[PDB]
């Protein structure tokens, strides 16, 4: 299979406006949401049909209780940060944990935190240590690194448990996650040549322009890979035409092991 990943995010807000949750936790496999929990529902719920169908109610019940506890811990942690930063008003706290299973069979794992949307603490599971970006993070680093057992627990969870969950979810959702829908690709003139692709899955795609068989990325405008809403994606890239000299321009698209070239006449 190609590369796949599993990750869980948390978001805490210290003084949220009316209605908005104080706490949200969402899991993803690749680009696909799989799970959701927030401080309003107080329930962990599936976000993909193949999760609902393959995980018995005991799974949602157990993790609902854990998430209620993680919610409270997140509040306490954010209260501590905002006191040590001496900040008033509403501030945000975020966490991301996850792993990747690469095509070649190797793995990665990661765990990090942010305050107001900026890196705060980053875990290194090989040195078993936390990187602190400032002295408020440094205080937290010292406390967390004093609990060596919990670092070892995170290493095992990233390297072993997370990968096992990911393989399990990949099988559950294999009809979605492991399919291929090839792009439909065309070239438009608008002056710049636009190379446009739509209808493809997975979202990972490489589109570029070559001029006389050479690539110059400094003159290519790369569009974002965007969801079309039906489970497929679209993307584009453009280069500007030289009005004083002809050139052989060609759009090159790579998607899921297939390469395509559109030479423009």
């Amino acid at each position: 299979m190609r590369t796949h990943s599993l990750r869980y995010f948390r978001l805490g807000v210290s003084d949220p406006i009316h209605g908005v949750p104080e706490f949200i936790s969402v899991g993803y496999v690749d680009s696909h949401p799989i799970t959701t929990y927030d401080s309003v529902t107080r329930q962990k719920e599936p976000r993909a049909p193949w999760m609902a169908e393959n995980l018995a109610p005991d799974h949602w019940e157990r993790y609902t209780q854990l998430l209620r506890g993680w919610q409270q811990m997140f509040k306490v942690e954010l209260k501590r940060l905002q006191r040590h930063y001496n900040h008033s008003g509403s501030h945000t706290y975020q966490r991301m944990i996850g792993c990747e299973l690469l095509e070649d069979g190797s793995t990665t794992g990661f765990l990090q935190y942010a305050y107001d949307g900026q890196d705060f603490l980053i875990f290194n599971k090989d040195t078993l240590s936390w990187l602190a970006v400032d002295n408020v993070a440094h205080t937290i680093k010292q406390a967390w690194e004093a609990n060596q057992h919990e670092l070892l627990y995170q290493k095992n969870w990233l390297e072993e448990e997370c990968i096992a969950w990911l393989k399990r979810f990949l099988e559950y959702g294999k009809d979605t996650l492991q399919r291929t829908e090839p792009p439909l690709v065309r070239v438009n003139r608008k002056t710049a040549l636009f190379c446009k692709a739509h209808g493809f899955y997975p979202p990972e795609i490489y589109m570029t322009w070559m001029k006389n068989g050479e690539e110059i990325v400094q003159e290519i405008d790369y569009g974002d890979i965007l969801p079309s809403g039906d489970g497929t994606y679209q993307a584009w890239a453009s280069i500007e035409l030289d009005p004083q000299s002809s050139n052989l321009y060609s759009c090159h698209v790579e998607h899921s092991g297939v390469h395509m070239v559109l030479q423009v006449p």
Partner: antibody, heavy 109, light 116 residues
Framework: GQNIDQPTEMTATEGAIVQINCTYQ??????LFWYQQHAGEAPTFLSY??LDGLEEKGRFSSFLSRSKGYSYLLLKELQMKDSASYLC??????????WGAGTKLIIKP | NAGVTQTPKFQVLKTGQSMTLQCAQD?????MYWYRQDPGMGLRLIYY???????DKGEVPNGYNVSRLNKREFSLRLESAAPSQTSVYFC??????????????FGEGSRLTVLE
């Protein structure tokens, strides 16, 4: 069907070394605990292992092999106060703590 | 600084009698647990409380109920005692839960005997 197995009882002589084994078959693994429980008293925490290898704490060491699904608690220079039950417990993929039935350690003075 | 305080240490009950076991912890822990211990078996979780304001069934909840009264207190209720509930009951607490490495702190145990 998740199982944790450890011998019912072991008997050793004062001053010697004893190794208490615990094997586990669980759906996922988030670490292995040992607790000591004197007769008529509450269990108390002895050790936690989650990566492979041996960890020492005084006269007690605890070993773990994740691939073999096995741990031992090693007690050196046995004393009479080591007479107690020793409970092994494992956290599964759902953080459920699954308890072995305990090993009663009897020490001959 | 007392740790986990549970009561009563001993109790005899007639089948059908009601009983509440009390447990408090002064360690500012968030998670609390009620276990039963019987010969020849590992500890079995009856009910637990992952955080103040939530509780859930363990593996053997039938015949029992619990109340997480506040952050400190977690009571266990036998509404209609049965002979099968003769056991030694342990309350325990942990700083948090849903994490690998945090250990349990146990109370001294409550020995209940239920008789016809």
């Amino acid at each position: 069907g998740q199982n944790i197995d450890q011998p019912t009882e072991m008997t050793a002589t004062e001053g010697a070394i004893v190794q208490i084994n615990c094997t586990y078959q669980t759906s996922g693994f988030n670490g292995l605990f040992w607790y000591q429980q004197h007769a008529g008293e509450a269990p108390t925490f002895l050790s936690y292992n989650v990566l492979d290898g041996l960890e020492e704490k005084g006269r007690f060491s605890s070993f773990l092999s994740r691939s073999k699904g096995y741990s031992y608690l090693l007690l050196k220079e046995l004393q009479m106060k080591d007479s107690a039950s020793y409970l092994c417990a494992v956290k599964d993929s759902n953080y459920q703590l699954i308890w072995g039935a305990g090993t009663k350690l009897i020490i001959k003075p | 600084n007392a740790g986990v305080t549970q009561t009563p240490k001993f109790q005899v009950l007639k089948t059908g009698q009601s009983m509440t076991l009390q447990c408090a912890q002064d360690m500012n822990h968030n998670s609390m647990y009620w276990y039963r211990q019987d010969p020849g078996m590992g500890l079995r979780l009856i009910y637990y409380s992952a955080s103040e304001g939530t509780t859930d069934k363990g593996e053997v909840p039938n015949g029992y109920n619990v109340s997480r009264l506040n952050k400190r207190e977690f009571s266990l209720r036998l509404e209609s005692a049965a002979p099968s509930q003769t056991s030694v009951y342990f309350c325990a607490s942990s700083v948090w839960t849903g994490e690998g490495s945090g250990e349990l702190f146990f109370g001294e145990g409550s020995r209940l005997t239920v008789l016809e």
